[PDB]
Scaffold this active site. Structure first.
Site, mmCIF file in Angstrom:
data_model
loop_
_atom_site.group_PDB
_atom_site.id
_atom_site.type_symbol
_atom_site.label_atom_id
_atom_site.label_comp_id
_atom_site.label_asym_id
_atom_site.label_seq_id
_atom_site.Cartn_x
_atom_site.Cartn_y
_atom_site.Cartn_z
ATOM 1 N N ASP A 15 -6.908 -2.074 -8.238
ATOM 2 C CA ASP A 15 -5.255 -1.867 -8.647
ATOM 3 C C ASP A 15 -5.614 -1.831 -10.267
ATOM 4 O O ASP A 15 -4.779 -2.914 -10.990
ATOM 5 C CB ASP A 15 -5.021 -3.329 -8.590
ATOM 6 C CG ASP A 15 -5.557 -3.551 -6.899
ATOM 7 O OD1 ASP A 15 -5.303 -3.082 -6.348
ATOM 8 O OD2 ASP A 15 -5.476 -5.122 -6.905
ATOM 9 N N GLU A 170 3.513 -2.456 -1.339
ATOM 10 C CA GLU A 170 2.678 -3.604 -2.477
ATOM 11 C C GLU A 170 3.145 -2.637 -3.488
ATOM 12 O O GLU A 170 3.091 -0.912 -3.709
ATOM 13 C CB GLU A 170 1.738 -4.414 -2.352
ATOM 14 C CG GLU A 170 0.186 -3.203 -1.779
ATOM 15 C CD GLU A 170 -0.959 -4.164 -0.784
ATOM 16 O OE1 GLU A 170 -0.910 -4.809 -1.834
ATOM 17 O OE2 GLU A 170 -1.840 -2.685 -0.766
HETATM 18 O O1 6LW Z 1 -3.997 -8.478 2.064
HETATM 19 C C1 6LW Z 1 -2.804 -8.508 2.874
HETATM 20 C C2 6LW Z 1 -2.433 -6.901 2.635
HETATM 21 O O2 6LW Z 1 -3.494 -6.564 3.504
HETATM 22 C C3 6LW Z 1 -4.263 -5.086 2.930
HETATM 23 N N1 6LW Z 1 -4.962 -4.418 3.770
HETATM 24 O O3 6LW Z 1 -5.696 -4.743 4.290
HETATM 25 C C4 6LW Z 1 -3.321 -5.228 1.485
HETATM 26 O O4 6LW Z 1 -3.674 -4.236 0.194
HETATM 27 C C5 6LW Z 1 -2.526 -6.338 1.594
HETATM 28 O O5 6LW Z 1 -1.265 -6.639 0.724
#
Ligand code: 6LW
Length: 502
Positions: A15, A170
């Site tokens: 990130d 996100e």
């Molecule tokens: O943890 C919840 C979501 O699951 C994900 N990837 O599997 C994303 O990066 C998160 O926002």
């Protein structure tokens, strides 16, 4: 001026967020259960980065009670405005969204300023003397205005976008260019489906229209399926000193069976961003390990020494503990060794052990340390752990046995398995150096005493991967000590820590 290798920050550095302060760049990553939190990097060229510190360095900034590889500190965003640096993140093991700030990145940052708007992956954008916050409550990107010093929300939250339809919207960031508000997000989840998408509007509060060419970066499609890099996403756009455009993003390097143990790492991509045009990332929305592209003028930075000594009496910013450490159990001796004081807490107890670690940053590496265990009761141990999670770790150690005898043990912790691979009797005189090697397939373990190296055998890498073990992090290599005996005052001294990647 031409060419670089990806990743630009190898090992567990997910990130990435970056800001430009004049000719200086500063970058932050998520750190999850580790203390100190939010590693903080500095670069002049976006390619070479020096870890200058960590944003969350005091217990008051960072409550990690019961934190693990799936909790703690999630995506951070770093922003620079009017002489103030802001770092905004979520502590999911504590009170959620907050920021800290400072006028000097190398100094101690502020106490947390706790924020009202929910969701995760908070980010800031500044204009007209106002501070706008975005985050992702209920899967929608929400916008509000805040006072960043007080944490007071000044406008109502508004839902501005919910992505192109892909899962887990996100990492929202707002930018302004050519009279458009651009909203960049991540979709697809942070595994093989990861993608970066972008929308724009003439108004900061929408309505946002998606780029017809979305996604702008992904290895999820046919064009990325053969790549040794997967899961490209969680990008942050940044301007070059020469007016070019770049993005930092996360990704990982895959291993056989679709595994990754080095965590999600920080990658760099060039971006074409003509006036009144949508951005295009590295021509076709993919990146490579060898990037044969023009760059900002390059300046190398300080890296991890091949032999770290403790003569200065301070651990560098790279070193990390599990949860909030018991600070009095890490001391520096008169002759300049690292001294670790035993507690009964094992590496499987879901609490902070006497444990301090460095991220593994190469598939092929060797690491070692001499271990001098002292004042030990029977079954007290100290050594090196190849650690992913409290239920997933390989431990190499010197153990105190009955009758002043000692041995080297190798123990694999995998869920309900605690497997002793080796228990080898030591010679009663001779300093022991413990040695962990790896390649993409196996960890190899051994020890050196009286000038002779002994192989203790090997264990598969896949059992410590994110895909196997779960969570959001990468393998770390930790020095540790655990007592398991009546009233132990055991401690161990470590004169150095060697790490060399191929
Ligand atoms: O943890 C919840 C979501 O699951 C994900 N990837 O599997 C994303 O990066 C998160 O926002």
């Amino acid at each position: 001026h031409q060419g670089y290798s990806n990743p630009v920050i190898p090992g567990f550095h997910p990130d990435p967020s970056v800001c430009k302060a004049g000719d200086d760049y500063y970058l932050v990553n998520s750190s999850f259960q580790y203390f100190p939190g939010v590693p903080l990097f500095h670069s002049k060229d976006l390619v070479h980065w020096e870890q200058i510190g960590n944003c969350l360095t005091r217990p008051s900034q960072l409550d990690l009670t019961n934190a693990n590889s799936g909790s703690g500190i999630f995506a951070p965003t770093i922003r620079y405005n009017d002489g103030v640096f802001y770092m905004i993140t979520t502590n999911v093991s504590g009170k959620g969204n907050f920021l800290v700030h400072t006028t000097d990145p190398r100094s101690e940052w502020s106490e947390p300023v706790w924020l009202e708007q929910g969701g995760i992956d908070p980010s800031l954008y500044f204009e007209d003397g106002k501070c706008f916050m975005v985050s992702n409550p209920d899967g929608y990107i929400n916008l509000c205005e805040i006072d960043p010093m007080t944490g007071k929300q000044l406008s109502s939250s508004k839902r501005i976008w919910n992505g192109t339809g892909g899962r887990y919207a996100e990492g929202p960031h707002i930018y302004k260019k050519d009279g458009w508000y651009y909203l960049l997000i991540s979709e697809g989840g942070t595994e093989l489906g990861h993608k970066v998408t972008i929308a724009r509007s003439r108004y900061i509060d929408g309505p946002y229209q998606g780029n017809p060419a979305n996604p702008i970066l992904t290895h999820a499609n046919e064009s990325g399926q053969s790549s040794p890099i997967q899961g490209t996403g969680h990008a942050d756009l940044v301007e070059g000193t020469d007016g070019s455009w770049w993005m930092v993003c996360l990704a990982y390097r895959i291993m056989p069976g679709t595994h990754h143990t080095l965590g999600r790492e920080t990658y760099l991509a060039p971006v074409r961003w003509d006036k009144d045009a949508w951005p295009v990332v590295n021509s076709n929305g993919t990146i490579s390990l060898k990037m044969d592209v023009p760059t900002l003028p390059q300046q190398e930075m300080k890296g991890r020494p091949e032999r770290i000594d403790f003569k200065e009496g301070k651990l560098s910013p790279e070193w990390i503990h599990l949860q909030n450490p018991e600070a009095k159990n890490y001391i520096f001796t008169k002759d300049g060794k690292l001294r670790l004081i035993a507690t009964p807490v094992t590496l499987s107890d879901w609490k902070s052990p006497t444990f301090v670690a460095l991220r593994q940053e190469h598939f092929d590496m060797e690491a070692s340390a001499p271990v001098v265990l002292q004042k030990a009761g029977v079954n007290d141990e100290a050594g090196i752990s190849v650690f992913m999670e409290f239920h997933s770790h390989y431990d190499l150690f010197v153990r105190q046995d009955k009758d002043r005898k000692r041995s080297v043990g190798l123990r694999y912790k995998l869920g309900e398995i605690t497997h002793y691979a080796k228990e080898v009797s030591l010679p009663t005189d001779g300093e022991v150096e413990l040695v962990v090697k790896s390649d993409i397939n196996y960890y190899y373990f051994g020890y050196k005493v009286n000038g002779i190296y002994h192989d203790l055998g090997k264990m598969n890498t896949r059992y410590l991967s994110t895909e196997t073990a779960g969570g959001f992090t990468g393998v770390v290599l930790g020095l540790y000590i655990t007592s398991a005996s009546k009233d132990s005052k055991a401690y161990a001294d470590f004169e150095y820590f060697k790490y060399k990647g191929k």
